[PDB]
Design an enzyme around this catalytic site. Structure first.
Site, PDB file in Angstrom:
ATOM      1  N   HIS A   1      -4.473  -2.678   6.693  1.00 25.97           N
ATOM      2  CA  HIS A   1      -4.118  -3.866   5.922  1.00 25.97           C
ATOM      3  C   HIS A   1      -3.297  -3.910   6.521  1.00 25.97           C
ATOM      4  O   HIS A   1      -2.149  -4.860   6.760  1.00 25.97           O
ATOM      5  CB  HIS A   1      -4.610  -4.009   4.326  1.00 25.97           C
ATOM      6  N   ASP A  57     -10.434  -1.353   8.309  1.00 24.04           N
ATOM      7  CA  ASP A  57      -8.684  -1.911   8.071  1.00 24.04           C
ATOM      8  C   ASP A  57      -9.027   0.210   7.609  1.00 24.04           C
ATOM      9  O   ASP A  57      -7.672   0.768   6.607  1.00 24.04           O
ATOM     10  CB  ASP A  57      -8.135  -2.083   7.586  1.00 24.04           C
ATOM     11  N   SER A  82      -1.283  -1.270  -2.010  1.00 33.98           N
ATOM     12  CA  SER A  82      -2.516  -0.720  -1.191  1.00 33.98           C
ATOM     13  C   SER A  82      -2.470   0.673  -0.950  1.00 33.98           C
ATOM     14  O   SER A  82      -1.727   1.310  -1.065  1.00 33.98           O
ATOM     15  CB  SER A  82      -1.788  -1.496  -0.114  1.00 33.98           C
TER      16      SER A  82
END
Lengths: 151, 151
Positions: free
Chosen positions: A28, A50, A102
């Protein structure tokens, strides 16, 4: 365990983590992956997925154990304490689960990474997340609660 | 002493070592040389010779002392203990001298690198190697016992 931040401009922007069976990188976000062994691996991204293809030599293959069905509500060891819920993502404390971190795996207490977070910044006075895992029979499906942004 | 492994895919595949007079890299194998000072040096390989030209600034020039004639049978300090033989390469222990550690210098106990290994995987219940050194009068000649592969 090999969970690695992603190097962008010489600072952490993502967090790549290798999983059982296949090596995983959250595609991502971008940024040069810190690990040199992963620095020479082709990228396989789908339209909504992703994930990096697993191209590590099979010496360190399957660093983890994947996660089966039958989600208990019990404790799952998270980077910031345990998490306890079953219907959806755990009611993480306010302030925690914000942004910039993330690609963080939630693992079972038995060493079985139940799911992979892909956002879910805020869900109210508590907070759930948008993650991906097996659907019911082992299907890599993502669930995104409304108001989900990468964390 | 500067003996350096060769970086290929982020792991050791060779072992570059600098010698008196000229800087040496075993050009039999490939891989990016770990040292940055050597990272910007042209390559001079002959038809059978796999040696790097000496292009280090003469501040660190002649890191070692070269080796003259009159080979004694005595101890030569090797990376894995001393070696003791005169007719040919020493009867190294079985298992030692296998593969993957190309470019290892054998030195005199006086700091005089007698020869440079360029293979010689196995020679029976003992093991000699294929190396290169001065012939009799200071001639860079290689000797290869039968059944020699890079080690």
């Amino acid at each position: 365990d090999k969970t690695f931040p992603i190097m962008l401009n010489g600072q952490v922007n993502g967090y790549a983590c290798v999983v059982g069976g296949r090596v995983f990188k959250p595609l991502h976000v971008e940024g040069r992956i810190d690990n040199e062994q992963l620095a020479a691996i082709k990228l396989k991204k789908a339209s909504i997925y992703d994930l990096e293809y697993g191209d590590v030599p099979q010496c360190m293959k399957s660093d983890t154990l994947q996660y089966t069905s039958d989600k208990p509500p019990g404790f799952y060891n998270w980077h910031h304490g345990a998490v306890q819920y079953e219907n959806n993502r755990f009611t993480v404390p306010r302030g925690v689960g914000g942004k910039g971190d993330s690609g963080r795996p939630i693992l079972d207490n038995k060493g079985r990474v139940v799911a992979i977070v892909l956002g879910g910044v805020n869900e109210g006075s508590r907070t759930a997340l948008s993650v991906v895992t097996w659907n019911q029979k082992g299907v890599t499906v993502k669930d995104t609660p409304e108001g989900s942004e990468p964390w």
